[PDB]
Each structure stands twice: as structure tokens, then as C-alpha cells.
Amino acid sequence: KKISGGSVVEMQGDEMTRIIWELIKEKLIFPYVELDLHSYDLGIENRDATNDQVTKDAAEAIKKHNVGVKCATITPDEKRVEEFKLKQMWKSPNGTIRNILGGTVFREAIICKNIPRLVSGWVKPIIIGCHARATDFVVPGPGKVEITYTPSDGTQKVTYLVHNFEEGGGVAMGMYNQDKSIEDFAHSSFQMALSKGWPLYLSTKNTILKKYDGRFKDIFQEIYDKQYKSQFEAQKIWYEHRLIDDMVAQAMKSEGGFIWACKNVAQGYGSLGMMTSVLVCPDGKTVEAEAAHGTVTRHYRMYQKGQETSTNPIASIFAWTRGLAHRAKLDNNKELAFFANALEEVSIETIEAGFMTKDLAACIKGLPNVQRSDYLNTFEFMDKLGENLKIKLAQAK
Amino acid sequence: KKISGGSVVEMQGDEMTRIIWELIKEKLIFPYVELDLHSYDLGIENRDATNDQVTKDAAEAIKKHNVGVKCATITPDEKRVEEFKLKQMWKSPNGTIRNILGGTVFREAIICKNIPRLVSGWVKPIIIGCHARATDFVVPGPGKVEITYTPSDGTQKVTYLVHNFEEGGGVAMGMYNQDKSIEDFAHSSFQMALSKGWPLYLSTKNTILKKYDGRFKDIFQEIYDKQYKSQFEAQKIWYEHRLIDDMVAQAMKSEGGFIWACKNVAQGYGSLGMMTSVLVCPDGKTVEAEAAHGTVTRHYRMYQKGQETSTNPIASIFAWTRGLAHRAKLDNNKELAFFANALEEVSIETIEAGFMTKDLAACIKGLPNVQRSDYLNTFEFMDKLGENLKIKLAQAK
Numbered sequence: 001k002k003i004s005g006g007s008v009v010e011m012q013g014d015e016m017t018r019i020i021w022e023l024i025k026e027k028l029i030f031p032y033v034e035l036d037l038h039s040y041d042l043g044i045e046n047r048d049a050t051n052d053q054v055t056k057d058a059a060e061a062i063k064k065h066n067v068g069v070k071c072a073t074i075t076p077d078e079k080r081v082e083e084f085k086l087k088q089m090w091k092s093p094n095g096t097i098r099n100i101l102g103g104t105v106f107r108e109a110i111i112c113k114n115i116p117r118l119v120s121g122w123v124k125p126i127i128i129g130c131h132a133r134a135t136d137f138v139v140p141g142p143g144k145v146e147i148t149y150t151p152s153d154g155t156q157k158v159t160y161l162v163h164n165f166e167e168g169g170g171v172a173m174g175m176y177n178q179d180k181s182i183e184d185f186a187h188s189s190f191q192m193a194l195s196k197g198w199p200l201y202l203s204t205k206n207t208i209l210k211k212y213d214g215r216f217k218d219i220f221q222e223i224y225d226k227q228y229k230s231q232f233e234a235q236k237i238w239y240e241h242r243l244i245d246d247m248v249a250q251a252m253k254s255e256g257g258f259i260w261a262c263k264n265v266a267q268g269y270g271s272l273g274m275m276t277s278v279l280v281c282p283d284g285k286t287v288e289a290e291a292a293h294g295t296v297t298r299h300y301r302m303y304q305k306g307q308e309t310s311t312n313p314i315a316s317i318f319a320w321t322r323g324l325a326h327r328a329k330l331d332n333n334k335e336l337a338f339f340a341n342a343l344e345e346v347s348i349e350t351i352e353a354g355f356m357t358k359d360l361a362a363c364i365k366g367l368p369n370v371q372r373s374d375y376l377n378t379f380e381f382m383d384k385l386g387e388n389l390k391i392k393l394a395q396a397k
Numbered sequence: 398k399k400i401s402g403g404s405v406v407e408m409q410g411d412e413m414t415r416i417i418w419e420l421i422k423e424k425l426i427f428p429y430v431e432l433d434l435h436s437y438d439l440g441i442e443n444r445d446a447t448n449d450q451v452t453k454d455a456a457e458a459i460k461k462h463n464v465g466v467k468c469a470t471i472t473p474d475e476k477r478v479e480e481f482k483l484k485q486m487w488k489s490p491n492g493t494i495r496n497i498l499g500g501t502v503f504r505e506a507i508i509c510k511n512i513p514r515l516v517s518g519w520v521k522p523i524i525i526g527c528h529a530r531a532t533d534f535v536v537p538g539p540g541k542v543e544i545t546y547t548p549s550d551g552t553q554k555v556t557y558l559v560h561n562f563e564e565g566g567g568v569a570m571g572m573y574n575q576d577k578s579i580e581d582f583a584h585s586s587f588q589m590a591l592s593k594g595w596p597l598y599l600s601t602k603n604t605i606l607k608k609y610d611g612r613f614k615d616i617f618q619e620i621y622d623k624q625y626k627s628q629f630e631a632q633k634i635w636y637e638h639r640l641i642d643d644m645v646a647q648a649m650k651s652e653g654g655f656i657w658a659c660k661n662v663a664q665g666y667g668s669l670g671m672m673t674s675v676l677v678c679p680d681g682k683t684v685e686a687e688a689a690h691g692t693v694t695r696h697y698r699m700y701q702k703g704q705e706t707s708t709n710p711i712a713s714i715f716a717w718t719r720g721l722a723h724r725a726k727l728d729n730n731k732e733l734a735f736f737a738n739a740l741e742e743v744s745i746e747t748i749e750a751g752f753m754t755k756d757l758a759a760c761i762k763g764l765p766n767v768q769r770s771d772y773l774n775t776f777e778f779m780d781k782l783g784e785n786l787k788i789k790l791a792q793a794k
């Protein structure tokens with residue numbers, strides 16, 4: 001009976017979500033889809049044990065299995081190493097999976113028709129990709145800064161004048177990119193638009209920085225022809241470079257439903273729980289999905305002592321849906337996506353029905369305006385999901 | 398009878414606004430306040446005549462008279478030089494006044510309680526300052542880029558590795574700043590908060606770029622102590638550096654009423670006509686105010702042929718109010734500010750009364766939802782202003 005998803009890697013999370021992660025697993029995941037879960041613990045409690053080697057292993061799993069998902073996980077900081085008695089600050093597993101897989105992260109909030117928004121006229125979400133090191137130095141006194149490319153083989157030096165500092169000091173910075181890096185940001189950006197079937201819009205500041213951002217605009221349009229052009233004329237999708245303002249002008253002058261690639265990592269007006277992050281590798285195969293929000297300190301301080309907490313587990317539900325929908329298309333299981341496709345609405349319908357958790361309730365009438373009879377708490381929201389779903393399956397399957 | 402404003406420079410504008418500028422002058426300005434207007438034409442039609450020398454003169458006026466105002470004006474571009482038969486593309490008078498006066502531009506939309514917004518819970522506007530050249534180069538092949546500070550006197554070279562490029566090429570850029578430039582951005586930022594009496598919040602990406610953005614955070618807090626500290630403890634105002642997200646988190650988690658200084662020029666969610674730009678020189682004296690929006694191609698194509706147009710002249714009205722309120726405090730004329738203070742509400746009340754121009758009407762029900770009986774057109778909106786004002790004066794003065 002259970003549906004066949006094959007190999008879907010998974011990252012055991014942390015703190016409050018880790019149970020939300022289990023609650024989601026226990027409820028909306030396990031009773032329905034059979035899978036190959038290689039489930040690795042990214043808990044910092046497993047990061048004092050194996051000395052980080054699970055994480056790079058975890059990354060390698062996706063690189064083979066082609067699909068990870070990730071619950072929220074703590075980045076070790078000042079409080080952690082003292083309060084968890086950590087052997088060392090371990091590298092941020094967000095970047096620790098990214099740097100390994102490379103890849104581009106596409107954040108988007110989810111559209112619930114009844115909740116407030118930066119734009120009431122956004123029907124479909126704007127999926128915002130972004131590119132993201134840099135050297136910086138304080139040039140404490142007058143002098144001529146020069147950023148000089150010196151070739152590797154002995155070829156002519158390339159001299160540039162950043163500025164010649166006279167009155168007072170200055171400050172400066174280097175910044176760089178690679179065709180590898182940009183084509184990484186390129187294919188991953190087009191593949192994201194392929195799966196989402198939405199228009200792609202790149203934007204750089206082209207006139208303000210000519211050669212640097214022109215290369216970005218250069219490289220998509222070179223790839224948007226030689227590579228993706230036919231797949232875009234099919235299924236109507238198109239790539240239009242725009243200027244930042246010539247884009248953000250039509251940001252609200254458009255409704256949504258397009259992939260949007262920034263050259264400049266949260267921002268947005270969407271409540272954190274709303275947004276679902278996704279990570280992809282230009283290959284169009286490896287796809288690592290996660291919640292877009294922190295590991296929820298709040299609700300957790302109210303967790304250990306048993307009190308009633310209300311937290312919105314949608315971004316984590318979609319981490320599965322994205323993982324599963326991007327699982328199916330890879331393996332061509334039309335059953336599995338349908339499960340995933342339907343589970344989105346199931347998570348949307350409940351709030352569309354007006355039955356929603358605090359943050360949504362708390363944003364409707366205003367922040368103190370929230371009351372327990374205007375929402376539902378956390379553990380009880382995983383109930384209605386399988387409920388609504390199993391029925392939204394019942395007629396379907 | 399007429400009020401004494403003294404010397405207030407003025408920039409004759411262009412296109413559709415230039416008449417809005419005159420309509421505002423004719424109606425809400427001339428019959429009430431006497432002034433010393435040195436009124437210079439920034440029209441591109443005066444930029445084929447004097448060969449740009451009025452502009453730098455215009456800038457020098459403010460530098461002495463301490464107050465300019467500016468109507469919108471065309472930047473010469475491809476269409477202009479052919480259609481106006483321009484002798485040359487003349488430098489953008491926005492930057493042509495800025496570079497001369499230096500100074501920082503503080504954009505803000507105006508708050509009308511009845512109009513939609515990025516945040517329904519913003520009572521008072523967020524005044525967004527921003528800092529804003531850069532060298533960029535494409536390093537077509539493998540090599541080691543280095544940004545090397547070489548001192549002016551022969552002192553030890555300072556070597557940095559941007560990156561060493563191997564597989565494929567790269568791209569890079571230089572970027573720089575000056576204490577002069579940042580303290581320019583500093584004093585001008587604090588003075589803006591002084592006049593507006595609002596909290597100042599600087600934000601840089603401090604942890605992502607340590608030394609470069611730390612210097613900014615360095616310099617305000619150095620100035621926020623040694624200079625403005627006492628004036629801020631008085632009148633309760635405070636300067637809190639925050640991180641970009643640790644700011645934008647409280648952007649909507651706060652209502653507004655604070656000056657907000659970005660290190661990174663429109664953006665925003667506010668309709669262009671809403672926002673009023675202001676330009677200030679760290680001296681806290683020279684203040685050049687203007688509308689924040691383009692010179693309105695639309696309405697103008699519909700202008701020459703006599704048809705009924707509807708365009709919202711609030712940003713230009715406030716250019717005077719800001720110019721006049723920042724005029725009074727300089728010269729201590731309590732009459733003149735009161736005129737200016739009151740004129741803001743007069744421009745706010747009319748729309749608060751629900752009587753508003755198209756864009757506001759057109760944003761209330763949606764863009765095609767606009768109808769002529771849901772708003773009022775342009776020439777007729779300068780009527781109600783002096784009307785409401787002269788009465789809002791009548792009881793007052």
C-alpha cells in the first residue's frame with residue numbers, strides 16, 4: 001500500500017523543530033510513504049560525538065541519493081558551547097552542506113489566501129534565489145590602493161586604481177566570483193525555474209557596476225540560449241534580465257509566480273515559519289530542502305516544562321513536499337508527487353479553512369490581538385493535517 | 398501679512414511636474430509665504446543654453462542660502478538628445494548637486510492612514526538613508542588577484558589575496574570609502590535624526606564583512622558618543638546599530654518613526670508619488686529637498702493634447718514643507734514652520750478625508766479597479782489644498 005519514494009536522505013534536526021520533525025514524520029510521512037531514509041543526526045548532540053564527520057557524510061548522501069531534506073539545526077554560538085558543553089564550535093551545517101554541494105538556495109514563503117502579505121495582490125509566491133567571500137582592509141593612512149590582477153603564467157600585469165587616499169584614511173574591500181560559481185548560480189537558477197515552470201528574472205545592477213554585474217547578465221543570457229532556450233519556449237517559461245528597480249518595480253506590479261535571482265539570507269516580509277527554503281545543484285538533480293526559519297528558541301523555552309506552545313510547522317512540511325515532489329520527477333513516480341502535491345494544499349487548506357496556528361492568527365488582528373481561541377497550538381495541528389489529507393486522499397486514492 | 402522665509406533657493410523642474418511645481422507655487426506657496434527665491438532653471442531647455450553652468454551655480458546657492466528645493470528634472474538619455482536636440486548628455490543633476498554638496502539622501506514615503514502599505518502597522522514613516530564608485534574587471538583567465546594597498550610615502554606595502562583563479566576565469570571588483578565619506582554619511586545621518594527627533598538605527602553587515610562594515614559601525618558609535626550623545630539623551634532619541642536582519646526583523650516588528658541608515662536608489666513599497674526625498678550636508682544646515690519620484694512621462698504624454706490627467710503632487714508639496722520646516726529651524730521663524738507643519742496635514746487630511754488622486758484610489762481597490770468617480774484629477778487637487786489649508790489657517794492665524 002505504502003508509496004515508493006526510494007532513497008530520500010534526511011537530516012535529524014534540533015530543539016523544538018526536531019519533534020515537529022518527528023511529529024511530521026510520525027504523522028504525515030511514515031503511515032503513507034515508504035522510503036529509503038538514511039537519516040543522519042545533525043544534532044549538535046551528535047556533533048560532540050563523531051567530530052563533525054557525519055555532516056560531510058550527510059552531504060555525500062544527497063550527492064548520491066540526489067535528495068536530502070533538513071530539519072532546523074542549531075549553529076554553535078556563544079550560548080551553545082557553554083550550555084551544551086561543546087568540544088568546539090562546529091561549522092554551520094547550512095554552509096557545511098552548501099559549500100560541499102555548491103548549489104543555490106531558493107527561499108519562498110507559501111501563499112495562504114487568507115493571511116496578510118507585503119502585497120495583497122500576490123497570488124503565487126516569488127521564489128527569491130540569491131548568490132549570497134571578500135577581503136576587506138582599513139588602509140589606515142593616505143596611500144593609493146590598487147587591485148592588480150597578476151596572471152599565473154607571467155603574462156602582463158593588470159593594474160587598477162581603486163582610489164588614492166589623501167585627507168584622512170580610507171577603507172576598501174576585494175570581491176570576486178568565478179564562472180564556475182556563476183554558472184553554478186546559473187544552471188541552478190534555470191533548473192529551479194524549470195521545475196517550478198515559472199518565469200525566471202535575473203537582476204543585477206548593470207549600469208551601476210558594468211563589467212562585474214554585466215558578466216552575470218552575460219552568463220545567463222549565454223546559457224538561456226545555448227542550453228535552456230528550447231525547454232523554455234516549450235512550457236512558455238522565459239528568462240528576462242531586468243535592473244534591480246526595473247525588477248522591483250514589477251515585483252508588486254506583478255502578482256508572482258516567477259523565480260527571482262538576486263546578486264548582492266532571510267529578508268522578505270513573510271513570517272519565518274511561512275517561508276520554505278530549497279537548495280539545488282546546477283545538475284538539476286541533488287535537491288536539499290529545508291525549513292527557512294530558525295530552530296525556534298521560543299516555544300522551546302516553553303517546551304521543557306510542559307506548557308502549551310503554538311508553532312507553525314508548515315515550512316518543515318514543505319521541506320518534505322519539495323523533497324518528495326523533486327523526488328518523484330527524478331524517479332518518475334507519479335504517485336509520490338501526487339502525495340506531495342496534495343499535501344501542500346492539505347497544509348494550505350487547513351489555514352484556508354481559517355484554522356491556523358498562532359503566528360498566522362497573531363498576524364491577522366495584530367500581535368497582542370492573538371488569543372488561544374483564535375488559533376490552535378502546535379501538537380494539535382499535526383492532527384488536522386493527516387485528517388484533511390487522508391480524506392483528500394480518500395476520494396483521490 | 399505674508400510670512401518671512403528669507404532665502405530659499407529653488408530648482409525649476411521639468412515636464413509634467415514643472416507645472417505641478419508652478420501650480421504648487423501659484424497656489425500653496427506664493428499667496429502665503431514671502432521668500433527670497435533665487436529660482437534657477439534646471440530644465441534641460443536651460444541645459445542647452447548655459448552649458449551646465451547654472452547647475453553648479455544652483456548647487457552653490459544652497460551652499461550659501463542653506464536651503465534648496467527641487468522639482469523633478471529629466472536626466473538626458475537616448476530619447477532626450479534626439480527629441481530635444483540636445484548638444485550633449487548633461488550630468489544627472491541629482492548627482493550633480495549631490496557630488497557638490499556631498500550629503501546624504503533620506504527617502505521616506507508619507508503616511509496617509511487610509512492608504513495601503515507594506516505594513517498596515519506602520520504609524521509613522523521609516524526614513525531610509527543610504528550611502529549609495531567601484532572598479533570592476535573580468536580577469537579573463539587563471540591568475541591570482543591581489544588588492545594591494547601601496548602607501549603614499551614608501552611605507553611597507555600591504556598585500557591581500559582576493560582569490561587565485563584556476564579552473565576557468567573569474568571576475569572581481571574594488572570598492573572603497575573614506576572617513577570623510579562615512580562621517581559625511583554619519584553627521585548627516587545624526588542631524589537627520591535630530592530634526593526628525595526619531596531614533597537612529599545604523600545597520601551594516603558586520604559579521605559577513607568584518608573590517609569594512611565594522612568601520613561604519615565603528616564611526617557612528619564613535620560619533621554617537623563624542624558628539625551627539627547629549628543631544629540624544631535630551632529628547633530621548635537613541636542610536637542603536639543593528640544587523641541588517643536584526644534590523645529588518647524589527648522593521649515590521651516596529652511601527653516606524655526612526656531614521657534608518659543603509660550600507661549597500663528607490664526601492665520601498667510606497668508609490669513613487671508618496672515618497673519625499675531630502676538631501677542634507679553633515680553641517681546640519683544645507684538641506685536640499687525634492688520629490689522622490691520620476692518626472693512623470695505618463696500624464697505628460699496625456700498632457701500636451703489637453704486630456705484630463707490625474708497625478709499626485711504630494712512629494713512636491715513636501716519638498717516645500719521640508720524645505721520650509723528646515724528653513725525655519727535654521728532661521729528660528731516659528732511662523733514659517735507652522736505654515737509648513739500645517740501644510741503637511743492639509744496634504745494628509747484631504748486624502749484622510751478620502752478625497753485623493755488616482756494612484757491612491759487606484760491602489761485601494763486594485764489597479765484596473767480605479768475609476769474617475771473614485772478619485773480626483775491633477776489640476777483640481779491643488780484647489781482643495783489651499784482651501785483646506787486657508788481654513789486650517791483661518792482658525793489658527
Ligand SMILES: NC(=O)C1=CN([C@@H]2O[C@H](COP(=O)(O)OP(=O)(O)OC[C@H]3O[C@@H](n4cnc5c(N)ncnc54)[C@H](OP(=O)(O)O)[C@@H]3O)[C@@H](O)[C@H]2O)C=CC1
Nearest residue numbers: 072073074075272273293294295296297298311312313359
Ligand atoms: N536552519 C536554519 O536555516 C536556521 C537555523 N537557525 C537556528 O535557529 C536557532 C535560533 O533561533 P532563531 O534563529 O532566533 O529562530 P527563532 O524562531 O528562535 O526566533 C526567530 C523567530 O522566528 C519566528 N518563528 C520561527 N518558527 C516559527 C513558527 N513555527 N511559527 C511562527 N513563528 C516562528 C518566531 O517569531 P514568533 O515565534 O514570535 O512568531 C521567532 O521569534 C539557532 O539554533 C540557529 O542555529 C538560525 C537561522 C535559520
Ligand SMILES: NC(=O)C1=CN([C@@H]2O[C@H](COP(=O)(O)OP(=O)(O)OC[C@H]3O[C@@H](n4cnc5c(N)ncnc54)[C@H](OP(=O)(O)O)[C@@H]3O)[C@@H](O)[C@H]2O)C=CC1
Nearest residue numbers: 469470471472669670690691692693694695708709710756
Ligand atoms: N528627479 C528625480 O529624482 C528623478 C528623475 N527622473 C526623471 O523621471 C523621468 C522618467 O520618468 P520615470 O522616471 O519613468 O517616472 P514616471 O513617473 O514617468 O514613471 C514612473 C512611475 O512613477 C509613478 N508616478 C510618478 N509620479 C506619480 C504621481 N504623481 N502619482 C502617481 N504615480 C506617480 C507612475 O506610476 P502611475 O503613474 O502608473 O501610478 C509612473 O509610471 C525622466 O525625466 C527622469 O530624468 C527619474 C527618476 C527620479
